[PDB]
Amino acid sequence: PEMVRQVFDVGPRYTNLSYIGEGAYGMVCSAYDNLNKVRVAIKKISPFEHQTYCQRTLREIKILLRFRHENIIGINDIIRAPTIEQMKDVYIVQDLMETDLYKLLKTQHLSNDHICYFLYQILRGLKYIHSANVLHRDLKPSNLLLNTTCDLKICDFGLARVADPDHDHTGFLTEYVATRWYRAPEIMLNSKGYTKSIDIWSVGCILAEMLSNRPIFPGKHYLDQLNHILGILGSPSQEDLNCIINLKARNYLLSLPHKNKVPWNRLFPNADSKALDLLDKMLTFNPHKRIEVEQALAHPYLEQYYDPSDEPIAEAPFLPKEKLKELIFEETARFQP
Numbered sequence: 001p002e003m004v005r006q007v008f009d010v011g012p013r014y015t016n017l018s019y020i021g022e023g024a025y026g027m028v029c030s031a032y033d034n035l036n037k038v039r040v041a042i043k044k045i046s047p048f049e050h051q052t053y054c055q056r057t058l059r060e061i062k063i064l065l066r067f068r069h070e071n072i073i074g075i076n077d078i079i080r081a082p083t084i085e086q087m088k089d090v091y092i093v094q095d096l097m098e099t100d101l102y103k104l105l106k107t108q109h110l111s112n113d114h115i116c117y118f119l120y121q122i123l124r125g126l127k128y129i130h131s132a133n134v135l136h137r138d139l140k141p142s143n144l145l146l147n148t149t150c151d152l153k154i155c156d157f158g159l160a161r162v163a164d165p166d167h168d169h170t171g172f173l174t175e176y177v178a179t180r181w182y183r184a185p186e187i188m189l190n191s192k193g194y195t196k197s198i199d200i201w202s203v204g205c206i207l208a209e210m211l212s213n214r215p216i217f218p219g220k221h222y223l224d225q226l227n228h229i230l231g232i233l234g235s236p237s238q239e240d241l242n243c244i245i246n247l248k249a250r251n252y253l254l255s256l257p258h259k260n261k262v263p264w265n266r267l268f269p270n271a272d273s274k275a276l277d278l279l280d281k282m283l284t285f286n287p288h289k290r291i292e293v294e295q296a297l298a299h300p301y302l303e304q305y306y307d308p309s310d311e312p313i314a315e316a317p318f319l320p321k322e323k324l325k326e327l328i329f330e331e332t333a334r335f336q337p
């Protein structure tokens with residue numbers, strides 16, 4: 001088997017490997033597809049020792065095999081051993097992109113036209129995801145891939161879940177898995193992240209980061225994340241506080257000194273005014289007042305791209321590790337000769 005840094009056993013169809021980056025449970029390589037005569041991306045996954053890893057791998061495979069959308073990366077092939085006894089790793093083959101938005105923002109300033117086009121494609125993909133009753137729950141620059149002509153695709157459904165708004169309520173300061181800087185304020189107050197507004201907040205954070213090439217809320221631990229959010233949004237209104245019935249969460253907010261809102265055009269003096277208007281509506285403190293994906297697509301900032309007939313929706317909306325390995329084996333059987 002061909003080896004990189006680690007067994008990367010994808011031959012003989014896929015040859016001439018090059019290291020790219022990292023997935024959750026293994027590395028990502030580029031390779032030559034000898035059948036299709038094009039280079040592809042391959043992610044190695046080794047989840048079978050841990051139950052939670054098998055959960056993350058199975059649910060992502062299930063979601064991506066049903067999804068078909070121009071702004072969501074698809075699974076072209078899945079490589080694994082012919083038997084459950086022999087399969088230790090799984091390889092996911094996907095289109096080879098040029099970069100991810102995290103790396104791009106490290107060194108490239110975006111024109112307003114690029115910001116607009118990137119945001120349009122994120123929301124177009126997100127409309128499809130949400131139309132399937134699915135939440136991505138970990139949107140961030142490193143999970144957005146771009147090709148050489150700036151077509152954008154959403155990657156990593158590792159933390160995705162079916163929406164469950166009737167069971168979203170939780171206590172104050174309960175732990176959360178998704179990446180800190182892109183967490184909506186209600187995660188730290190009273191939300192399990194089971195509603196679609198959790199994704200819109202992350203997109204708002206991504207928009208702000210495209211405007212300035214730096215994360216807008218770079219919190220350095222759990223409750224510090226809320227410090228950063230309130231430091232820019234200012235203190236929540238009485239009405240928004242009244243929507244927080246949990247006493248521990250509400251009294252925490254009531255204990256804070258008053259904070260003024262920082263105007264978006266002071267933070268982003270170069271930004272298009274329409275982009276800042278949409279940014280404000282995505283980074284709304286109250287999740288029930290936060291703009292939804294279809295409203296965001298219809299916002300004037302995105303007028304040159306908006307076309308609901310060309311923004312498709314899903315046709316079909318949505319355990320011991322040994323049973324999960326068996327389910328992963330079964331879910332990947334369609335790609336076997």
Ligand SMILES: *[C@H]1C[C@H](C)OC(=O)c2c(O)cc(O)cc2OCC[C@H](O)[C@H](O)C(=O)[C@@H]1F
Binds near residue numbers: 022024028098
């Ligand atoms: C999803 C992982 C897929 C395999 O990533 C890619 O396809 C991919 C690509 O085609 C080109 C480049 O330059 C990077 C890349 O993935 C980078 C890894 C990414 O930031 C996350 O860690 C992922 O795993 C990704 F969402």
